[PDB]
RNA sequence: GGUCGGCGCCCGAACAGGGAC
DNA sequence: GTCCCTGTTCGGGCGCCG
């Protein structure tokens, strides 16, 4: 019937009532089918008939559940939910396949009407209230309370997962070696027993939770391979990803936009080298879900692509402690990332990307580091602990760029792979002036009313320039300043500024800008032979600053 | 038989509500095995979601210990229990630590559960276990007595600290002893065999008086003084003199009598940076009046016991760090620089979480205080490693900059 | 047509701090 | 007061799980 596990006291945000809204009027079809419902909890002990001293209400429906004819009645409890206490979540994260270790029998059940099996708050049944019509305009209609769990109430999951940990924890206790992955109402329940002693410690623990008013209908999968599970396939010595089907539009909608990248990003787990970036980048400038937008020619490449990826087959294994993780990451372009961690080569325990752009300037360095930091993460949810890295980085590489920094930089143990492109700075500044190099006195300003401004620089060989520059601020026109001298010098050049923000943004080493001017001073940079950069303080007279 | 204090937040102030970060196995392990003794002995126990209130919960080992070690992350706790643990009850910090030759750190934190902890007040110190690959659903505890972490338990246990530490202070009234969080700090002036032998001393008394502990000797007099330093050279070019004027344009928002005239006369015209360039006489003036003012301390430099301490940290490169703690902008109450720490020439996380905790520590000592921190580091980069690095019993504040090097002020 | 909790990815807008005219 | 860097912190949308 119902649990006898106790009750999880729960209040109302202080000061606030209970919810008071009428029916959405619904069909026919859905009428009937809570009809037979209410009727059903209320034979069970789950629902009560309530007078009229209850002032509260609070709209209803259905809807089906996945590949079945039985309907799900929901509560839209939103007010309510507004008006309750705040909870802290249980639910962490998720579970994953390549986070699986090795077990001899497994079993997959799951909960029979999870949420209606736990009783609710005596003293908070009351603002549960909901009407059903019997018909939508001929009769008032019997309406009700819970008792136990709603469907749409923002306390239901946490309290549900609290009281599923509190009644499998006796059993857990009795059976230390029964690994047990509790997600929501999902069992999996994995062992080392052969067969029998695994049947009847599942048997075993059916009935625990029956003693404790759960249900575990025959929707088991006894130990027949392949299990349906978080949205996987688990077979014995491999799990793949459940079908995945891709949009296919004539005409796009940015509603079907966000459905494919979202479908993207779920194959991507195990999928290596879908990106997404040509087809995220139409998402930008949008404003209804249903404005349709046209598909640039490289969205269209990066389509086919992905398309031609998801087809050649793939599958994950699980996780054997006692080898080491190796995470291997490739650049792809664009600021985009893959990556795949396996513990025996060509045998990924899963893959990833990483494509996220942080700053207005950037580097590949830099985006390697927080691929690294990405991957470092995720492996600490799954396995809790930090894979060893190939990175196509050359060592010398990562101790110049991380040596010189005035930022702390780190990457854990990793070695270098050849497989290109390899990630490279494409530009390094001069620590000393360089003799017999032309030195530049650099100088921008603009005027923050009219918003014109001037560029140039004055040369120690008498070379000069002045631009006049239209729809300017005091930053643009300090980066053109240096732009200027970059362009009008020889491979060897010494420039003197008074831009701490210019300087700044060079002495980071960019490769990539949002500003087209920062691309072409990187341009310019990576042309020279020596490039030394100064700063000097402004209003002291130094040169022609 | 033993009586709660009350105690209650900063009016206008919620409990903390912060999200439990992932943990690597053998972190999940060793607090598992912790939280369950500790259950056992009803120091702490299990509640559920409908306490909405949640703060971040790690492990760490303390320098050459072996030993797993249970870290809450009070820091929002106790920035909301403020006029509680700082007013009410705060714990005095004698001036005359700093000046001893010798100060030992004892951890002290494990006496603080002898303690019950106000009912009301359990709620608040609520945590959550994780689990690797989200197998279960976090496991939720609370206290029941004094946590180790939150500043009110060393507030509430001054009473039982005094108490039993009185025989001994009689005994040694030479001896200082500050006690900050989970740590007692014992400075004396003997020479250090004498030192030594008392801290031991101190061991036994506490051992007997029921609170165990789990080398950590200090010596403030070493604490180096970092200034500012101007280069000396026989030949001068165009770019030295650029770099000594914005080095000591710099210095003028500190030391105020500093001037650059003469000097930047010479930097008149648009000459070849590499081109030398004779001091003027006045330039030659100018500058040593000015290495003058700089071996001088700046003026009118004071602790507000009011206001709070920031630290600054600067990577210098090869292993080398700079630091200032100041109240106010340019009033430095300190300066310094640390060389050749753990990680130095291989991990700069783990070199900066070395630097965090010695300024800390050094700022306990002196001020009773703890400074907040900013860190010379991206905000990702340093979440994701710094856990890795701690070894200690209490946590800083800090917040993140990106300030590149134009000038080198700190070092030469 | 419509509810909830978690995790992922992306978009947005505010607010705080800090520099530079 | 604009312009332009660190960081919060809330909202939205899609995917996936229950
Ligand atoms: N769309 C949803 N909205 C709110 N709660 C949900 C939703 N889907 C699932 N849940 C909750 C309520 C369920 O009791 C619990 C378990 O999920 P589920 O197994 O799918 O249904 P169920 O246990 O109630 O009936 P069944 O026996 O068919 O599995 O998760
Ligand atoms: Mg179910
Ligand atoms: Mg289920």
């Not at chain 1, 009727?39 to 008939?49: H, L, Q, R």
């Not at chain 1, 994260?93 to 799951?110: M, R």
């Not at chain 1, 009644?167 to 999902?186: A, G, H, T």
């Not at chain 2, 979440?383 to 504040?397: C, D, L, N, S, V």
Request: proline share 7%; hydrophobic share 35%; glycine share 6%.
């Amino acid at each position: 019937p119902i649990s006898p596990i106790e009750t999880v006291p729960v209040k109302l945000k202080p000061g606030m009532d209970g919810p008071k809204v009428k029916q959405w009027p619904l069909t026919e079809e859905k009428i009937k089918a809570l009809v037979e419902i209410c009727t059903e909890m209320e034979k069970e002990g789950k629902i009560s008939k309530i007078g009229p001293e209850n002032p509260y209400n609070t709209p209803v429906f259905a809807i089906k559940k996945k590949d079945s004819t039985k309907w799900r009645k929901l509560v839209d409890f939103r007010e309510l939910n507004k008006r309750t206490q705040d909870f802290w979540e249980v639910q962490l994260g998720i579970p994953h396949p390549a986070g699986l270790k090795k077990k001899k029998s497994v079993t997959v059940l799951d909960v029979g009407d999870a949420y209606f099996s736990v009783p609710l708050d005596e003293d908070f049944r009351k603002y549960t209230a909901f009407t059903i019509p019997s018909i939508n305009n001929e009769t008032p209609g019997i309406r009700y309370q819970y008792n136990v769990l709603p469907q749409g109430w923002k306390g239901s999951p946490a309290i549900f997962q609290s009281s599923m940990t509190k009644i499998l924890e006796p059993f857990k206790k009795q059976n230390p070696d029964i690994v047990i992955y509790q997600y929501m109402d999902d069992l999996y329940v994995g062992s080392d027993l052969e067969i029998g002693q695994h049947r009847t410690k599942i048997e075993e623990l059916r009935q625990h939770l029956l003693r404790w008013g759960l249900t575990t209908p025959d929707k088991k999968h006894q130990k027949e391979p392949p299990f349906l599970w978080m949205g996987y396939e688990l077979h014995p010595d491999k799990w793949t990803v459940q079908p995945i089907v891709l949009p296919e539009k004539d005409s796009w909608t940015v509603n079907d936009i966000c459905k494919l990248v979202g479908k993207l990003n779920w194959a991507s787990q195990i999928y290596p080298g879908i990106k997404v970036r040509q087809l995220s980048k139409l998402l930008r400038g949008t404003k209804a879900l249903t404005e349709v937008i046209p598909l640039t020619e490289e969205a269209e490449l990066e389509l086919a692509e992905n398309r031609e990826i998801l087809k050649e087959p793939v599958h994950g294994v699980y996780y054997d402690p006692s080898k080491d993780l190796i995470a291997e990451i490739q650049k792809q372009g664009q600021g985009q990332w893959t990556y795949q961690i396996y513990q025996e080569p060509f045998k990924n325990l899963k893959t990833g990307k990483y494509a996220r752009m942080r700053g207005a300037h950037t580097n590949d360095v830099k985006q390697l580091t927080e691929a690294v930091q990405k991957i470092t993460t995720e492996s600490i949810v799954i396995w809790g602990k930090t894979p060893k890295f190939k990175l196509p980085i050359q060592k010398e590489t990562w101790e110049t760029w991380w040596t010189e920094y005035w930022q702390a930089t780190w990457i854990p143990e990793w070695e270098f792979v050849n497989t290109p492109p390899l990630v490279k700075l494409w530009y390094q500044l001069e620590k000393e002036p360089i003799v017999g190099a032309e030195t530049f006195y650099v100088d921008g300003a603009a005027n923050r009313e009219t918003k014109l401004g001037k560029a140039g620089y004055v040369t120690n060989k008498g070379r000069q320039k002045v631009v006049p520059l239209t729809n300017t601020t005091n930053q643009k026109t300090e980066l053109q300043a240096i732009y200027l001298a970059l362009q009008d010098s020889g491979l060897e050049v010494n420039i003197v500024t008074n831009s701490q923000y210019a300087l700044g943004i060079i002495q980071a080493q960019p490769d990539k800008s949002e500003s087209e001017l920062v691309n072409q001073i990187i341009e310019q940079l990576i042309k020279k032979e020596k490039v030394y950069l100064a700063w000097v303080p402004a209003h002291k007279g130094i040169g022609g600053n | 038989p033993i009586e709660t204090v009350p105690v209650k937040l900063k009016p206008g102030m919620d409990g903390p509500k912060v999200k439990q970060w992932p943990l690597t196995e053998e972190k999940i392990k060793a607090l598992v095995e912790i939280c369950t003794e500790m259950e056992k002995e009803g120091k702490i126990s299990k509640i559920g979601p409908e306490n909405p209130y949640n703060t971040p919960v790690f492990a760490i080992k303390k320098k050459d210990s072996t030993k797993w070690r249970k870290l809450v992350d009070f820091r929002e706790l106790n920035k909301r229990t403020q006029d509680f643990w700082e007013v009410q009850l705060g714990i005095p910090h004698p001036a005359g630590l700093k000046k001893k030759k010798s100060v030992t750190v004892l951890d002290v934190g494990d006496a603080y559960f002898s303690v019950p902890l106000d009912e009301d007040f359990r709620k608040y110190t609520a945590f959550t276990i994780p689990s690797i690959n989200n197998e279960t659903p976090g496991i939720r505890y609370q206290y029941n007595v004094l946590p180790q972490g939150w500043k009110g338990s060393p507030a509430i246990f001054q009473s039982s600290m005094t108490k039993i530490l009185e025989p001994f202070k009689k005994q040694n009234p030479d001896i200082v002893i500050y006690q900050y969080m989970d740590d007692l700090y014992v400075g004396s002036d003997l020479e250090i065999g004498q030192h030594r032998t008392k801290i031991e001393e101190l061991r036994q008394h506490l051992l007997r008086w029921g609170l165990t502990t789990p080398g950590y000797e200090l010596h403030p007099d070493k604490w180096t003084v970092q200034p500012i330093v101007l280069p000396e050279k026989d030949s001068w070019t165009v770019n030295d003199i650029q770099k000594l004027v914005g080095k000591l344009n710099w210095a003028s928002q500190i030391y105020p009598g500093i001037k650059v005239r003469q000097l930047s006369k010479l930097l008149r015209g648009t000459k070849a940076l590499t081109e030398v360039i004779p001091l003027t006489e006045e330039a030659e003036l100018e500058l040593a009046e000015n290495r003058e003012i700089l071996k001088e301390p700046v003026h009118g430099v004071y602790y507000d016991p009011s206001k709070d301490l920031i630290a600054e940290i600067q990577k210098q490169g090869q292993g080398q760090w700079t630091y200032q703690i100041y109240q106010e902008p340019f009033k430095n109450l300190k300066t310094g620089k640390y060389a050749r720490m753990r990680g130095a020439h291989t991990n700069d996380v783990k070199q900066l979480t070395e630097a965090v905790q010695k300024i800390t520590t050094e700022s306990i000592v002196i001020w009773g205080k703890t400074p907040k921190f900013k860190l010379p580091i991206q905000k990702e980069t340093w979440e994701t490693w710094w856990t890795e690095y701690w070894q200690a019993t209490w946590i800083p504040e800090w917040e993140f900059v990106n300030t590149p090097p134009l000038v080198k002020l700190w070092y030469q």
